[PDB]
Design a protein around this ligand. Sequence first.
Ligand code: MG
Ligand code: MG
Ligand code: MG
Ligand code: MG
Ligand code: MG
Ligand code: MG
Ligand code: MG
Ligand code: MG
Lengths: 77, 149, 117, 190, 51
Amino acid sequence: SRVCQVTGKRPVTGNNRSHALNATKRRFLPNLHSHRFWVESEKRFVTLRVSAKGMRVIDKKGIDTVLAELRARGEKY
Amino acid sequence: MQVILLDKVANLGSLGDQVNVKAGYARNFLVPQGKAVPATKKNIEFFEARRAELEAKLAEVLAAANARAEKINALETVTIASKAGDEGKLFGSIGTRDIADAVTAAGVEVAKSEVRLPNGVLRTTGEHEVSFQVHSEVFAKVIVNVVAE
Amino acid sequence: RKQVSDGVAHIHASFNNTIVTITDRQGNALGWATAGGSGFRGSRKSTPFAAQVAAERCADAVKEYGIKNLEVMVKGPGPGRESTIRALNAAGFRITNITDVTPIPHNGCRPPKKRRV
Amino acid sequence: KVYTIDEAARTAKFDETVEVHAKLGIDPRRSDQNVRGTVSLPHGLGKQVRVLAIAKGEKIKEAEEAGADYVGGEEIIQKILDGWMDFVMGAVGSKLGRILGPRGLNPKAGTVGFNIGEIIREIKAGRIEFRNDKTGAIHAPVGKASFPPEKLADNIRAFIRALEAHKPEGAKGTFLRSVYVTTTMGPSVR
Amino acid sequence: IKVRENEPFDVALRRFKRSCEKAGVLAEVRRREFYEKPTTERKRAKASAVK
RNA sequence: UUGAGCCUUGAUGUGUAGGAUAGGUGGGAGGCUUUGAAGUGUGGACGCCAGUCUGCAUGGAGCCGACCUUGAAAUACCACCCUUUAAUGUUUGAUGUUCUAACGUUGACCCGUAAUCCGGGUUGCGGACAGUGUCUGGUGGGUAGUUUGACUGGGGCGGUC
RNA sequence: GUUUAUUAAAAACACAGCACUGUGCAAACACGAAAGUGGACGUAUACGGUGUGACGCCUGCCCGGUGCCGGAAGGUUAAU
Ligand SMILES: [Mg+2]
Ligand SMILES: [Mg+2]
Ligand SMILES: [Mg+2]
Ligand SMILES: [Mg+2]
Ligand SMILES: [Mg+2]
Ligand SMILES: [Mg+2]
Ligand SMILES: [Mg+2]
Ligand SMILES: [Mg+2]
């Protein structure tokens, strides 16, 4: 399902809001994308369905720390 | 990002600078093929320890691979016991492991392949000269005197 | 821009008009002028004169490469066929060789029909 | 430089041939290009004028002493009216217009001094300094400045001539001060 | 067709073109197809060219 | 590389009385050119082929002024430039050129595996495009929610408020 | 041939035939937030949509409006 493995981001519900202020149930979807990440410490490519923000989370924390987290909450990669 | 480099790296890098690169380039190419790394600050000082050490320290140690020759001109004369044929012309002859082994064997300790006797290298008696090598730019002259005993 | 000296004068001489273009040996267009584009329209431009005045116009335009000698290929019937080269000899040009290149079918395409005037 | 390289006037004869041509804005909406009554300039400059004013058969004995040379007459209004190569300047206000002897036919001369008591009273200086520069075609400014007898001493005209910015219109950016002439050209900013 | 005229002269010298092309096969092909009517033409070209 | 800004370097003007193809005002009674010219002779060239400029050159030494006319007088010289055009840049894209490593592969192959899924790997083909997320202009009876007045010798029409 | 099972069987629907138009295949199109699947284990002599309706003899003029197709220099114009 459209869930970022780094951040938990997922679809949210809201309204489109016309000029005349008509609300209509709508969705916001996270900017998802599956990305191969070279894990040096694992001589392997781990590919993650991540949100763009996710990627930035990975760039800052470093993929080892992030995978460390998935491992910590038994999110299987 | 910022990211600090590893190898030389083309139109931007250096060998250990703190450039700034588009993340698309950092992930996907550079860091994976370890040519650079996240400037995680933790790191940028991992590099400050690496800005004092090898450089400031081991180049006044090549100021010792250099001041070995401050003792190349303060003696400036070894003699070789090599005689003379029919007119003061060496009955012997002295090369590099003769001018490095008859250099080492005193207070003048040189590495045997650090003695340039361009050939003369050698074919007569008396005083000669040689080019003594310890550094790439700083060598030093002496005077050699094949003594006919 | 550039220079060439050795060249060719190309003239398209039809009945309604005659168009002149100077080009190097390798037919690569150096300058041009038309009997119609120098004034005269109608019976006006269908004249050996209008052609003469064109050949002229066309020189001051390709002397833009200090041309010196040029072969001369002549195509079509109608006036200014030859009158347009007389203008050229004088204009100030050596004039090597002269060929007629009016194309001739070995009887193929049916030509237009009428002209019940 | 930051101000104006007045020393950027270093083979004619004299270089008072340098000109106050500071820029101004377009006419977007409504805006004009005007010069007041003889723009003086905190600087005498050293100009002995020939000021042609329309005074009377009275002020020929002190209204000729006020930074000038002569003053036209009342007999010489239309009596000196019979030649083209025969015939700043001004006229005294209140109730006096001159288009019956100053309107016909393409010149520029309107400001002098409106006096009904003194021909050159105690304190009235400012006339014999500089001329007038109004709207020409695309803008205004055109005039003259300093000379080859000053350094940044004619830069009293720098903060007192390019400081002559009058209300802009609505869609412009009227600032760009430059001068020079008779040899080359240049300047700085504004 | 071709005149590669050489040195001393200025005149055209191309009387050649009044020996073949131009108004020859050109005035010819320019217009009405013909078909069987040249036969009527050339049938007068011999009645003439007899004398 | 090329469309728009903006900043310097150089262009140029056939209203009428005339020495003659006067752009508007302004400094302005002399600068200039041997820091090697007028004009003959061509070069690139703008174009209403009416004539202008110049890097170059044969060249070899003075032209000018209110001079009287013209609503406005100097190719005497210079400008801040408008008519409109042209040559480096600055940077912005944008259009374009390749690369491969993100990403697509509903080509081929290997293994998990006796598997037309899926995963990993190899290879080829594409490639920073495509595609998707957020934002945004357009279109949108395909769907949806509704509106579509009252008087009235019934109602509607007409008329009226 | 079909059809209003239960007041209409017909001139209505379908039909072979014809035309227009979309579609280069991961087709267009359609059921699906999606994966996936029909189209098709097909590939322009194929597949979809629309209208006309064996066949014979034919199918004239109009592009102003509305719809569509192409076009782009200018004008107008969104987030930014
Ligand atoms: Mg509805
Ligand atoms: Mg409701
Ligand atoms: Mg009612
Ligand atoms: Mg029934
Ligand atoms: Mg029945
Ligand atoms: Mg079909
Ligand atoms: Mg029907
Ligand atoms: Mg029809």
